[PDB]
Design a binder for this molecule. Sequence first.
Ligand SMILES: CCCCCC/C=C/CCCCCCCC(=O)O
Ligand SMILES: CCCCCC/C=C/CCCCCCCC(=O)O
Ligand SMILES: CCCCCC/C=C\CCCCCCCC(=O)O
Ligand SMILES: CCCCCC/C=C\CCCCCCCC(=O)O
Length: 583
Amino acid sequence: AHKSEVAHRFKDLGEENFKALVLIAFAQYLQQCPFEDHVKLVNEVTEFAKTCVADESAENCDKSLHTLFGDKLCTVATLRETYGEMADCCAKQEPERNECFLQHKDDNPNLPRLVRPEVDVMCTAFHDNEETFLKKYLYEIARRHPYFYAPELLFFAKRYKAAFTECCQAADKAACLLPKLDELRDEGKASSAKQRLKCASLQKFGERAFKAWAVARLSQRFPKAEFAEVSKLVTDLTKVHTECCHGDLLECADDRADLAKYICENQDSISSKLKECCEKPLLEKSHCIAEVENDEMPADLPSLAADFVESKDVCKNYAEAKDVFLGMFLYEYARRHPDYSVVLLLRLAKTYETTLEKCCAAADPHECYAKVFDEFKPLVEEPQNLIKQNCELFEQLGEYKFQNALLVRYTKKVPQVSTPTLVEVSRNLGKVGSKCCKHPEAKRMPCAEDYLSVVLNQLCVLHEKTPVSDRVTKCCTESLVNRRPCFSALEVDETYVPKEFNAETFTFHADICTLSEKERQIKKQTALVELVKHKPKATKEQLKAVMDDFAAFVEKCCKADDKETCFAEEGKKLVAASQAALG
Ligand SMILES: CCCCCC/C=C/CCCCCCCC(=O)O
Ligand SMILES: CCCCCC/C=C/CCCCCCCC(=O)O
Ligand SMILES: CCCCCC/C=C\CCCCCCCC(=O)O
Ligand SMILES: CCCCCC/C=C\CCCCCCCC(=O)O
């Protein structure tokens, strides 16, 4: 385990995973190296690994992984020419060498975008050589996201393999494969967006706020565990997290493996759902535990009223160790409510906290905080009702028209955002509607919280980069607890001057009869935004009526003999017919 580390890892992970992970790891530091150069390093390091597996005492096998990895990079011939100052790391010794190498990874590496090829090209190369196809895939993706946690990249790659194997043997290949690739693309973006997000909030809001989140989530996850067990897990998760944000793969991997191992030895104190996850090999344990469903809540748990409102010792128990007492409050409220979004429980803890700070300093504290549960009622119900209305609207409209409803709604709130971004955000929220509303009330709020925090990151990313609105900046730099409530609170922009009418913007051709669904939808949806941008006062009945005539327009000219001129001529009509109705 400790003697030769390379040999322990090769035995722990097996040859295939080790190769994959070594490929990923080199691809994450050496981003501008060609695949064939990467394949060659991996084969060298893999053969060197095997000598150590035969003999822990063979030469250099006793070296550390950081030493060996660093050494290997320093051999890359074009290290100075390609990577510039990254070469200068090789002058240092192996505490500092490793750290210097980690500094020079490049988040924005400036490579061209990866164009998903055609299904038949893909399925052919997959059949032609699975390993080359997949590991080239893997390299191309890893080198554009050098901070993406390597084993989680390997688990996505395994599901890439599975999708190709099922779909390249099917009748309608593209109908099978394309929707799997969209699923996998979005998870990977979400999982990368959610990694990037939780690290920044650690650095911006501190270790206390993060521990508050962890207590919430772990208690919902493990409601049968004692507070003391939950709190231990919060301390060790907080460290695992702190260290993975720093970004040293092996450091991250050891911490997580240690937490997974401790959890697997203490199941009885934590959950009865981990039996399977804990029998899995090291590579997969922590990931598996991370995604396990909530444990069943204990029967007939009592009111929080006794310990947190009615007790005469509330202020005393609070004042002697505040954060613990709030931790206990957050624990008991959260284990009773796997139906709340984590950030809703954090509102409630903060509301409680604020009332205890006020009332324990007051003339009569017991009278003062007697009704603190009344303050919770409206904060609980605000998201419940908003989920209900939006999922009702989605049931009557379907995904596509629900997106238009949203597209209109948010164009009116923030007309300054560019039209392509309004289209992407709308569409994306439509999918959140489509997934999360298929759950019953019990699970709607957790689903939305994890999907919206992805979509709302993408948005603040785009808006940090190209700002247009103070109000959008406000919500994007608030607490992560008020982020969504902030965006929800945005009113319709009443300063906005209607956009100048442009003719080409509402000029259509027969190319829309020929496009795919998505593309046709995006081009329709782009036009509805620009329409709302020119006629922002347009009512729901006026907008629907413009859409209905347009629903006829496209369907007339798309099937009525030799057709590009209707588009030109029956187009002139609709524009003017609309301009009269809206003006
Ligand atoms: C000499 C070069 C060294 C190359 C090896 C690099 C990485 C190998 C191991 C990767 C991480 C495995 C642990 C996963 C566990 C966890 O996430 O819970
Ligand atoms: C950059 C502009 C786009 C803004 C997108 C904001 C989406 C946030 C999630 C839900 C907000 C809706 C709640 C308010 C009331 C409502 O209209 O139902
Ligand atoms: C003993 C275990 C740890 C205790 C954790 C602290 C208790 C909760 C503190 C009050 C609520 C804070 C919510 C998030 C803060 C934020 O908005 O940035
Ligand atoms: C568009 C379909 C579903 C929309 C859901 C309705 C409004 C928000 C749901 C409540 C979630 C609580 C807050 C979590 C988000 C966060 O602060 O990042």
